[model samples]
Target: AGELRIAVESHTSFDWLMPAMGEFRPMWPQVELDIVSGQADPVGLLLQHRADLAIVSEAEKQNGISFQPLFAYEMVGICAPDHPLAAKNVWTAEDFIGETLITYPVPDEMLDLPKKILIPKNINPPRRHSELTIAIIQLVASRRGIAALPYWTVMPYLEKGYVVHRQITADGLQSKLYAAIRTEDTDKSYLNNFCQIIRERGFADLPGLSELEP
Candidate 1:
């Protein structure tokens, strides 16, 4: 295909896939990508055919869409490497109460902090929202607050030692990113080509196989 349209959450948009896909373009010289990033409603854009491909966190269970599990990873708490929390042997969701919780998508699985736990009484709501993962990490790094994100997704920050990881002692919060496409379009040859590139080299930090279906 001469061109393929794609959309992604801010996390995948600016951080990983864009750089990887840019490199893949030479291999797919005939293919052009109309890439859109940082959309609050990325999934909605895809559902409406505004994009040929999309990368998202959660899919509509009733949207009748398909999913490709790019990889599996867990959520962990992040603070300055020298912060008191870093010295803790372990961590739990209760540790986050009244603590500044920095994250993208309040429901992000890798974040692992339950909305109920953060708001034990479900009394108040967050004052801010981050549109991208890097922004969330940066916000945390600046001590705006502590953050929780996917284990692998935070490796770059860990490698720099600006942040430290502490496990969330909760269940069902481990997460995986998905390459989402319409149920009927999973087999498109061009989409497969792009997906194949992702499988081989898109996210070395996170393992991915072939295109997965809903």
Candidate 2:
């Protein structure tokens, strides 16, 4: 193997990726890894050939590309401990009224919370935005706003008591993740192994991940 380039979406978080890479590194020390991380959309980087692989929440049908279901995660809400909703076991669209909704600086439709939950109910909140996940978490912790993120992204902050999280509903806001690679590279052994390692270790090590069904 030569260089293994990977582009990861921002919400995936290094906390979820690094531990798996730590294990993969020992297994392939000779290969140089070029990781382009924390982009809102890494799939474009993959298509442009800037990355050999991409990890993203959504899959699309495209020419010369292939996606493998890697895992699944839920969109969970986070807010300051003393916030009104913190005492509740679950949240609803109506809860967001009069609250500030902190989010990544992207179109609302691209966000799971707004796309799947809020918009349909005509529930809208005053918005605060940042491209960095840490900044959004900090804003929520400071009581400036509430944010919904993949549980893995905010788990450490929740554990540290910087913020608390609750499910949006009893069943939860669920999404699946996928690994994308050029169709031409589908049979490449290293790429195959990379996908396998991510699937296996990501489910085992990450806090709020589940197996993606066949």
Candidate 3:
């Protein structure tokens, strides 16, 4: 009966959202849905009132924003399958030295590599930007640069041998996606159901996903 403006981080949005519409549409037949992408962190869009819901991966706490944990997935390093860097099963921050970092057009603070690994160690590799996830992987496959992306989203590329994914560290970075909505919107029945649908499909459909709750 109303519009649901969803601001989604690029990674899983393209992969899961389309399939999800099949179910959500039948349930909320009259509600219109619009998706805005190009982020792994949609908090900024959420606070600006451009979105009714935001699916983000960052763990930062914000004013007047409530978070619902969706599912946990790993972020891995991707490089050309033949690239020497792919020889390593695990990559420490030190390995980022002298490597070209390819990524979405976002700042270091919003990225998994820099925020969790590179910046802490002060490894400032030069970067190349791509607005599309597949393009970033293609860039890596072309041996232009390497990238860090969500396992769930990049697995298809890896399976096709277009690229190889390596653990960022021995254990790897486990990033959990969350549904960000204004605090007062938490009780909206349709909104809550949407989150439930995401969680259900997240665990049942996504690969390399781990449980966030018992």
- Model 2 misplaced stretches (Cα beyond 4 Å): 37-40, 131-134
lDDT of 2 by residue, 1-214 (tens): 6667888764445666677677778888877877885444667777788888887667867888889888888889998998888998899888888999998776774677887889999988999979788788888888999989888777778778989988996678987888888888787777778778888787777777787753
Best-performing candidate as measured by lDDT = 3
Model 2 TM-score, 2 decimals: 0.83
lDDT of 2 at 163: 90
Q: In TM-score terms, which candidate is top?
A: 3
Off by over 4 Å in 3: 37-41
Candidate 3 lDDT over 126-168, as tens digits, reads 9998888868888899999888888888878867999988888
lDDT scores of the candidates, listed in order: 0.63, 0.80, 0.81
- Clash count in backbone of candidate 2: 0
- Where's the lowest-lDDT run of ten residues in candidate 3? 37-46
TM-score of each: 0.73, 0.83, 0.89
**Between which residue pairs do clashes occur in model 3?**
none
Q: Which of 1 and 3 is the better model by TM-score?
A: 3
